[PDB]
Amino acid sequence: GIVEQCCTSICSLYQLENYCN
């Protein structure tokens, strides 16, 4: 989930936008 992709690994715009509505 987002924590694994962005908190414990380096986040990206690409991944953040996966969580926009």
Partner 1 sequence: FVNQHLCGSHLVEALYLVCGERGFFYTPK
**Least gap, CB of 5 to partner 1 (angstroms):** 10
Sign of CA dihedral 8, 13, 15, 18: positive
Give the tokens for residue 13: 């715009």
CB of 17 to partner 1, least distance (A): 6
Residues written for the chain: 21
Cβ–Cβ < 8 Å for 19, 1 = no
* Residues 1-21, mask of contacts with partner 1 (x by CB under 8 A): xxx--xxxxxxxx--xx-xxx
Q: Nearest distance from residue 6's CB to partner 1, in Å?
A: 5
Residues at the site binding partner 1, with contacts judged by CB under 8 A: 1-3, 6-13, 16-17, 19-21
